[PDB]
Amino acid sequence: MAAAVRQDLAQLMNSSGSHKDLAGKYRQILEKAIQLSGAEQLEALKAFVEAMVNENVSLVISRQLLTDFCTHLPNLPDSTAKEIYHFTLEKIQPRVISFEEQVASIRQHLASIYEKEEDWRNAAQVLVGIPLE
């Protein structure tokens, strides 16, 4: 199922379609990825992030869909959410300047998981990573 998501995302990469239609199709793929359960969901969500950070996808689309993507992550189990947050930060790192808003949201959610688990140092380091100044 993750391969179908990767396939669908690869097909949209160089689409000429309108913003609302294109974003709507990416959102449909996101909803498909979110409806999976297990390693398939994890793999599909990673493929989604990998597609979003691709330079051939316009920032307007990637920013919108990564924000949408982020709103779905608190609904996932802690270990899954934590891994996806770290993966997303790592894949955003080469273009960190372009996704600052998403980085801040991710770091706040991630630090909250570490805090809930009493992993104080990791929670603090995650928040210290937010470039406030």
Tab-separated table of all heavy atoms in Angstrom, residues 4 6 10 15 17 23 27 32 35 50 54 62 67 75-76 79 84 87 94 98 100 103 128:
chain	number	residue	atom	x	y	z
A	4	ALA	N	1.927	2.216	-3.450
A	4	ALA	CA	0.876	2.869	-4.242
A	4	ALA	C	0.881	4.368	-3.939
A	4	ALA	O	0.712	5.181	-4.850
A	4	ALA	CB	-0.481	2.265	-3.910
A	6	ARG	N	3.603	6.114	-2.788
A	6	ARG	CA	4.827	6.596	-3.442
A	6	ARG	C	4.574	6.822	-4.935
A	6	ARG	O	4.948	7.870	-5.466
A	6	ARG	CB	5.977	5.591	-3.285
A	6	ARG	CG	6.657	5.599	-1.928
A	6	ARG	CD	8.053	5.020	-2.015
A	6	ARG	NE	8.410	4.211	-0.846
A	6	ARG	CZ	8.307	2.883	-0.798
A	6	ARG	NH1	7.841	2.209	-1.845
A	6	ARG	NH2	8.655	2.223	0.298
A	10	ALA	N	4.642	10.303	-6.869
A	10	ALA	CA	5.585	10.463	-7.985
A	10	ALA	C	4.876	10.996	-9.246
A	10	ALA	O	5.418	11.877	-9.919
A	10	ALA	CB	6.284	9.149	-8.288
A	15	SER	N	2.819	17.679	-12.076
A	15	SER	CA	1.469	17.949	-12.585
A	15	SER	C	1.323	19.430	-12.930
A	15	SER	O	1.913	20.281	-12.258
A	15	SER	CB	0.403	17.554	-11.569
A	15	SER	OG	-0.889	18.002	-11.948
A	17	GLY	N	-1.826	20.819	-13.136
A	17	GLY	CA	-3.135	21.152	-12.582
A	17	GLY	C	-3.170	22.317	-11.614
A	17	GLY	O	-2.146	22.674	-11.022
A	23	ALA	N	-3.594	20.234	-4.673
A	23	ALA	CA	-3.559	20.114	-3.212
A	23	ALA	C	-4.619	19.126	-2.721
A	23	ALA	O	-4.335	18.345	-1.814
A	23	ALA	CB	-3.769	21.468	-2.560
A	27	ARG	N	-4.014	15.809	-0.647
A	27	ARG	CA	-4.783	15.599	0.585
A	27	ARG	C	-5.480	14.237	0.570
A	27	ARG	O	-5.525	13.568	1.605
A	27	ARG	CB	-5.785	16.737	0.811
A	27	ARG	CG	-6.234	16.877	2.261
A	27	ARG	CD	-6.955	18.193	2.517
A	27	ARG	NE	-6.033	19.333	2.573
A	27	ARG	CZ	-5.902	20.252	1.618
A	27	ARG	NH1	-6.639	20.185	0.514
A	27	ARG	NH2	-5.031	21.244	1.761
A	32	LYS	N	-5.457	8.664	2.471
A	32	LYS	CA	-5.201	7.250	2.176
A	32	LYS	C	-4.059	6.741	3.063
A	32	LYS	O	-4.213	5.692	3.691
A	32	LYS	CB	-4.877	7.034	0.683
A	32	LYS	CG	-4.258	5.671	0.364
A	32	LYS	CD	-4.242	5.354	-1.119
A	32	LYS	CE	-3.322	4.196	-1.406
A	32	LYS	NZ	-3.641	3.540	-2.699
A	35	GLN	N	-5.216	6.403	6.721
A	35	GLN	CA	-6.127	5.271	6.946
A	35	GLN	C	-5.399	3.915	7.038
A	35	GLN	O	-6.038	2.919	7.412
A	35	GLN	CB	-7.260	5.238	5.903
A	35	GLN	CG	-8.246	6.405	6.002
A	35	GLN	CD	-9.106	6.374	7.244
A	35	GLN	OE1	-8.794	6.997	8.262
A	35	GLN	NE2	-10.227	5.677	7.179
A	50	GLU	N	8.831	12.675	2.269
A	50	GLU	CA	9.858	12.662	1.231
A	50	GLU	C	9.373	13.328	-0.054
A	50	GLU	O	10.146	14.064	-0.672
A	50	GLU	CB	10.371	11.250	0.968
A	50	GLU	CG	11.289	10.736	2.064
A	50	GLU	CD	11.841	9.343	1.829
A	50	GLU	OE1	11.164	8.525	1.162
A	50	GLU	OE2	12.953	9.064	2.330
A	54	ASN	N	10.602	17.364	-1.668
A	54	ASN	CA	11.220	17.365	-3.001
A	54	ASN	C	11.120	18.779	-3.592
A	54	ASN	O	10.033	19.377	-3.591
A	54	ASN	CB	10.541	16.338	-3.910
A	54	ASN	CG	11.259	16.064	-5.214
A	54	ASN	OD1	11.527	16.963	-6.020
A	54	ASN	ND2	11.539	14.797	-5.475
A	62	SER	N	3.719	22.191	-0.582
A	62	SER	CA	4.454	21.520	0.492
A	62	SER	C	4.192	22.104	1.873
A	62	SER	O	3.962	21.341	2.805
A	62	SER	CB	5.947	21.468	0.193
A	62	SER	OG	6.497	22.756	-0.009
A	67	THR	N	1.678	21.238	6.884
A	67	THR	CA	0.897	21.756	8.011
A	67	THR	C	-0.276	20.802	8.272
A	67	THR	O	-0.466	20.392	9.420
A	67	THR	CB	0.441	23.202	7.791
A	67	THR	OG1	1.588	24.041	7.663
A	67	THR	CG2	-0.406	23.715	8.946
A	75	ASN	N	-2.851	12.502	16.552
A	75	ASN	CA	-3.848	11.428	16.645
A	75	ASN	C	-3.211	10.025	16.627
A	75	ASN	O	-3.882	9.041	16.949
A	75	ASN	CB	-4.893	11.572	15.540
A	75	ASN	CG	-5.674	12.870	15.596
A	75	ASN	OD1	-5.861	13.482	16.654
A	75	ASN	ND2	-6.155	13.319	14.450
A	76	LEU	N	-1.918	9.937	16.264
A	76	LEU	CA	-1.190	8.667	16.181
A	76	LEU	C	-0.556	8.260	17.504
A	76	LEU	O	-0.311	9.135	18.340
A	76	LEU	CB	-0.093	8.735	15.099
A	76	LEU	CG	-0.515	9.161	13.701
A	76	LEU	CD1	0.668	9.196	12.791
A	76	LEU	CD2	-1.572	8.240	13.136
A	79	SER	N	4.945	6.489	19.972
A	79	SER	CA	6.159	5.995	19.327
A	79	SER	C	6.172	6.268	17.825
A	79	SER	O	7.223	6.636	17.267
A	79	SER	CB	6.375	4.522	19.601
A	79	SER	OG	7.725	4.231	19.284
A	84	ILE	N	8.007	9.821	13.353
A	84	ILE	CA	7.660	10.660	12.211
A	84	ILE	C	8.136	12.104	12.417
A	84	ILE	O	8.645	12.699	11.469
A	84	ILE	CB	6.160	10.546	11.861
A	84	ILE	CG1	5.833	9.134	11.332
A	84	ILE	CG2	5.714	11.634	10.883
A	84	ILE	CD1	6.213	8.819	9.779
A	87	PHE	N	11.911	12.044	11.818
A	87	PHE	CA	12.116	11.814	10.388
A	87	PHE	C	11.847	13.094	9.600
A	87	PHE	O	12.657	13.476	8.747
A	87	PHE	CB	11.218	10.672	9.886
A	87	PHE	CG	11.391	10.350	8.419
A	87	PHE	CD1	12.369	9.455	7.996
A	87	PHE	CD2	10.571	10.935	7.459
A	87	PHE	CE1	12.527	9.157	6.639
A	87	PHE	CE2	10.735	10.644	6.103
A	87	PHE	CZ	11.706	9.750	5.701
A	94	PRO	N	17.726	19.994	5.114
A	94	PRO	CA	18.367	20.661	3.964
A	94	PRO	C	17.665	21.933	3.468
A	94	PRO	O	18.301	22.755	2.805
A	94	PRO	CB	18.376	19.574	2.884
A	94	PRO	CG	18.237	18.289	3.626
A	94	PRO	CD	17.330	18.615	4.757
A	98	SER	N	13.027	27.255	4.661
A	98	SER	CA	11.729	27.295	3.993
A	98	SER	C	10.562	26.747	4.833
A	98	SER	O	9.410	27.119	4.579
A	98	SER	CB	11.805	26.568	2.653
A	98	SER	OG	12.695	27.215	1.759
A	100	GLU	N	10.450	26.690	8.476
A	100	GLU	CA	10.541	27.175	9.857
A	100	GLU	C	9.250	27.042	10.701
A	100	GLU	O	9.325	26.578	11.841
A	100	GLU	CB	11.030	28.616	9.881
A	100	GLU	CG	11.643	28.993	11.214
A	100	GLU	CD	12.179	30.405	11.262
A	100	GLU	OE1	12.655	30.902	10.217
A	100	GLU	OE2	12.108	31.023	12.348
A	103	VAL	N	8.728	23.357	11.394
A	103	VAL	CA	9.766	22.936	12.342
A	103	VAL	C	9.347	23.287	13.774
A	103	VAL	O	9.426	22.434	14.661
A	103	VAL	CB	11.150	23.538	11.985
A	103	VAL	CG1	12.121	23.472	13.166
A	103	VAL	CG2	11.743	22.851	10.763
A	128	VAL	N	15.084	23.740	22.473
A	128	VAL	CA	16.276	24.572	22.266
A	128	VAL	C	16.572	24.679	20.769
A	128	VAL	O	17.044	25.724	20.312
A	128	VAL	CB	17.477	24.044	23.083
A	128	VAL	CG1	18.803	24.644	22.617
A	128	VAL	CG2	17.264	24.307	24.566
